[PDB]
Amino acid sequence: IETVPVKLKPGMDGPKVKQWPLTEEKIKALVEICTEMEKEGKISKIGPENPYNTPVFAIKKSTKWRKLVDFRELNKRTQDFWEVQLPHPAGLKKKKSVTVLDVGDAYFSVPLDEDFRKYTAFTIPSINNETPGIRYQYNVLPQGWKGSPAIFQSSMTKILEPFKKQNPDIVIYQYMDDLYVGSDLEIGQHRTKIEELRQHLLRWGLTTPYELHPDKWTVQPIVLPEKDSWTVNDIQKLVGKLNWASQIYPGIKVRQLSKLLRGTKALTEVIPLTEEAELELAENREILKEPVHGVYYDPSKDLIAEIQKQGQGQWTYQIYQEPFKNLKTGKYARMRGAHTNDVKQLTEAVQKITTESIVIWGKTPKFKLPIQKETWETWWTEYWQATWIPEWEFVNTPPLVKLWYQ
Amino acid sequence: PISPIETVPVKLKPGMDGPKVKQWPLTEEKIKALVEICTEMEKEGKISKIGPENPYNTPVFAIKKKKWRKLVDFRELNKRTQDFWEVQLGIPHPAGLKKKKSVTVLDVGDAYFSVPLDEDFRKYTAFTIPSINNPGIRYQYNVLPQGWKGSPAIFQSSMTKILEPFAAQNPDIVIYQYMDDLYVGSDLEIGQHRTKIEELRQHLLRWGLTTPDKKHQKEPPFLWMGYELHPDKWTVQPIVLPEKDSWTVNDIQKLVGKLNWASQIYPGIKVRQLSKLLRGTKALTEVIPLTEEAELELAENREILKEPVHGVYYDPSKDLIAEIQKQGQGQWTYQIYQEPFKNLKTGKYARMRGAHTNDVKQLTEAVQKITTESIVIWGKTPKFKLPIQKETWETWWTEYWQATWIPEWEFVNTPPLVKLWYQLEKEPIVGAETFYVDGAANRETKLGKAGYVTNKGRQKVVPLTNTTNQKTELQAIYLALQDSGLEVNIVTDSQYALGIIQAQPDKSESELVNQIIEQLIKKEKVYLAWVPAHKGIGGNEQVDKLVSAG
């Protein structure tokens, strides 16, 4: 009932991001949604003297439409003041079970500082420039603004303090609109304690509409092929891959293996693995089991995720902050189902990686995505269920990172 | 008239004060025009005489480019006032308009003077008519001044609010708003459509906005933002391509401009060889000699512009369809239509976005551009009729390392068909000669050699002048292709050259890679393999010792 003064970082003007053209379906859903939000007083219509703008999209998260606002820019221009404005538990990655709750509707009770409201302005585009958009700004704490959990924290600690006293071994982490609740309980007990908390929140006026298992994640080790008859080409590939790996694990050796190729030989020639080359390859399989050494997480530095299309629904990914110092690696799979496509799977992978990243370190990684920029901006909202949006950019996958990470 | 609309509050940029640009001295004939205009404008309430304590000024001038007009120089005040929600930059596209039985075109005359300006901001509009002696007269504005940073937005918003009542009582009457124009359309009987125009005309006159009197005035065909709009069809205004002996950078720019413009309804327009000229450009003065390819292109454009073409308007019940046709050197063309020969619009796609590409990649990119365009114009994505078979595209998008969203489409069999002119092998070839290739160049003397060493025992080295390690690495592959049977394994150490070939290009900026492409088509099976350099694998170790050593 009383607002909290909010500042931009000093000497910094609000956002002027461009609204993306939307389909008539998505516009009609935004107008319906925004008409109701205007009746409930959460947003109001603004005049030409407000020059700011934040993009809006319509996603599905269900068969009713949600409205997702891209506060990525307003978050750069303020939330870091809210990243330092008045915390991440490292045990949440260790919990056997983790459940994600959407608590973003609690935000629509707290008024927003009337002097900051101009920065939340957004536009519902018209088709073909018939009209200028319908323009609104926010009166309440908007979802996706990183200052919303920052301001609501005090109320949310208050609501959760009962539950934390009772279940002292359960981990509760909040990131934006989500609570991450982790326990070591049996699955069935876990789902019960989740319902207990869900009911607790609903009892105090917190409308809440995902189960993860970080005890199964790891940093995927490199696997070398196991063949029955080797060709010159198989050894060349094997030697090439082990050569790449030796920038990472240092004790890998290739002398005895490339000795097998001495002289100019046809690529299809079958070479038998001598006893020495087998020992070198066996010793090299063993050094790939142990992990990397000096790969530590620097909280100040940015996390970067790289993704490789592998064929047949497989997608590999790496999270690192400095090249070759991989904090996590993994591979994703889609059950296809003759309704799958490259963009559905890329969009699903980005969300998995981002969730996984949030649990471990509490921040989203900046993605290098293997897709044409203009294709992403058109179709990403068709499978985006998450309420957050990571930073991203577009790249051309190198020719050998596909197979070495395969 | 003036208006009882509420005013938009307006601030200057924080920490800035009002403008104080002194008045340039004026010839007494112009001071006569200003005094009479200002007393008329004062008598209508649009401006007010002000006291002596107003510290701010803004220069004023008179002219009549052979009635008089007053013009004010708000450049300094514009710098000092806040930013506004940017006025409509884009314009509607003719192809996006829904067909209607009748369309009226209303000019709101003197529109900005018809809207009040925020009170506390009025002191910063003060201007001075010069006295003969020095004591000049001081006026300030009470309406939106013409030329101030905030007029187009505030008038735009005032107009939106003024319309809102009339629009709610008339859910039949479509009103596009664009600058100080209103375009009114309906499917009423022309008798009562003229009634509703008459209502709207007065509704605005009560809010103080005058509208054309002599009938509704402006009559078809409509000269609107470089278009021609008829009751049933639209087309662009007539293009004139200059005939010149020499061309400057500025002349070619104005020429791709006009050509780009015509390509939305004139199918077949090509502009790529012409914009290759501007690749360097530099000064708009620099004279850029044309190219045999640029000349052929310009010739072909004048040929297409010789006949007249038109587009039709939009019916939201009919489907939305696009076809794409190949045009040659990576140039493509498309039509979007609802009825099979009545085109809503056309357009071109000729971008490489890289040194080398191939047909399927380019077609997919064309389908992208159309999709982004249909969403902007009709709010939907079209059905695609395309000259490519599912096997061609399915193979391409599956082997492609980049993710891609192929729409639903039907094959239309209308050659030139889009095809993969070659596919490398995924497994090495048996009984085929294995060529170990390598190249080298000296990074200072720029001399070079490409060579190979095969397993049948063949060795060759070709000498090379004015090249780089990357160019020789490709010549090396090119050499192995030239000298091999119809099936060949090539093993390289070049990550650069591996990357370019594995991409399976079929057109290129460089003629070397165009040469390599011609080789690859003529071969039957080709497998390309990579090994790390300077690791003495065997085969590679001997080409390095042969070429790279010398």
Ligand SMILES: CN(C)C(=O)CCOc1ccccc1Oc1cccn2cc(C#N)cc12
């Ligand atoms: C002749 N024509 C365009 C049709 O028949 C299609 C129906 O378009 C309209 C529908 C409603 C309101 C106005 C319509 O016209 C315009 C729409 C957009 C821009 N404009 C600029 C002018 C001028 N000068 C007219 C229009």
Ligand SMILES: [Mg+2]
């Ligand atoms: Mg070499």
